[PDB]
Design a protein around this ligand. Structure first.
Ligand SMILES: CC(C)N1CCN(Cc2ccc(Cn3ccc4ccc(-c5n[nH]c(N)c5C#N)cc43)cc2)CC1
Ligand SMILES: CC(C)N1CCN(Cc2ccc(Cn3ccc4ccc(-c5n[nH]c(N)c5C#N)cc43)cc2)CC1
Lengths: 202, 212
């Protein structure tokens, strides 16, 4: 059983969402002035989300048992191992940042009370944490109770536009099929992800 | 000026993209994102998009005939066809930069075990095709990957949307017993830059030693 709370200033973005429930919260619900961001101390372009409103939101939503997940391009990598680890958690809270990110003290303060994980879903830049939250939720939820790249897959018809399904796949020879699929997998891995086999990246 | 077509059996999943597009960019004709239900191209009354895998095994494979028709209609020779797949080449910021100058992206979202390989192979004989993965985790299908790709690419298109960055701070200067690092308030901007560089170095070593 898992509860996931997502906190964001763009709740509309999270709409692509019995053993698990997901709730989306508008961060602005915790403001009292009639501004969630300001210029960074030390200078630089763009804006930083103030810790104040985040603190109030997380105070209400989180407990000491919560795993606080904070997407950030500067995070530890989020991988399938991470997804397995998080799949048995009772409560994930995903704090989605915007602008140039969230004041570091939010994560620091939270860590005095609960476990906090700053993670990145990949080596590219997004405009905010929301798309990352969707990826994280999908990867985690498909593992909730109740190495090499996959090779190519085929289905009917056996000939299409003059392109044949590899004849071994029609042979019914399980061992030959297993061996061919292993070869395709190791072949694809060397070409596309040599790092997975401990080789230099292109 | 970019057109993105997305093909998926879950068009409602692509709602956030439409949500994040500024009216100014659309009205300026800088971007157009269209989402297409793959079932529009099915052949049968049951609107079938999947079938059992040759060679056996669990799961299902998306049908080449349906996908072939969809891509035939939507793609041209100038299209960059993007196919998310857990077996893809890595999608990185370099990829996003390259794709940000394209006239036409088509993103083919798979489900189940993926798409019959002949779809991409056939397409590759008359347009540029890119099978890519957005990270080392497993999703249910290509839609969440498409959301990530679209955002990373479009934010590099003017006015449409190394080391790790260290921590950032803003007001108030003191909060829950934690002061902003005094160096940031020092007015010594060479020192501030050096402090930020060291923070970046330390964070990269701790979180991403692979980048070093
Ligand atoms: C890699 C560094 C060297 N460069 C790049 C980052 N630059 C700063 C910068 C630029 C934009 C944003 C937008 N933003 C706001 C909140 C937020 C949360 C997650 C993500 C996010 N992006 N990519 C991922 N894999 C993410 C995850 N998970 C992005 C977010 C935040 C921060 C600085 C330079
Ligand atoms: C990774 C393999 C070694 N093992 C794992 C589990 N099985 C493979 C398997 C499992 C689920 C799916 C679901 N699926 C259908 C279409 C599709 C497109 C993209 C993605 C996707 N997942 N992760 C990414 N970074 C992606 C991207 N981009 C996933 C997709 C497709 C394939 C078998 C083996």
């Amino acid at each position: 059983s898992m509860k996931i709370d997502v906190v964001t200033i763009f709740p509309e973005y999270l709409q692509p969402v019995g053993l698990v429930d997901v709730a989306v919260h508008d961060l602005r619900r915790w403001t009292h002035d009639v501004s969630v961001d300001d210029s960074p101390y030390g200078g630089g372009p763009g804006m930083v989300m103030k810790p104040t409103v985040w603190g109030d939101a997380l105070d209400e939503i989180c407990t000491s048992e919560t795993l606080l997940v904070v997407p950030t391009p500067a995070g530890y990598p989020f991988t399938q191992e991470t997804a397995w680890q998080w799949s048995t958690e009772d409560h994930l809270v995903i704090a989605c940042g915007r602008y140039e990110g969230i004041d570091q003290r939010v994560a620091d303060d939270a860590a005095t009370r609960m476990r906090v994980r700053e993670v990145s879903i990949g080596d590219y830049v997004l405009n905010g944490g929301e798309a990352a939250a969707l990826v994280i939720i999908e990867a985690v939820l498909r593992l909730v109770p109740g190495s090499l790249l996959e090779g190519p897959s085929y289905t009917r018809p056996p000939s299409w536009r003059g392109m044949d399904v590899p004849p071994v796949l029609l042979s019914g020879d399980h061992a030959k099929i297993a061996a061919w699929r292993a070869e395709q997998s190791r072949q694809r891995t060397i070409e596309r992800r040599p790092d997975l086999l401990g080789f230099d990246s292109p």
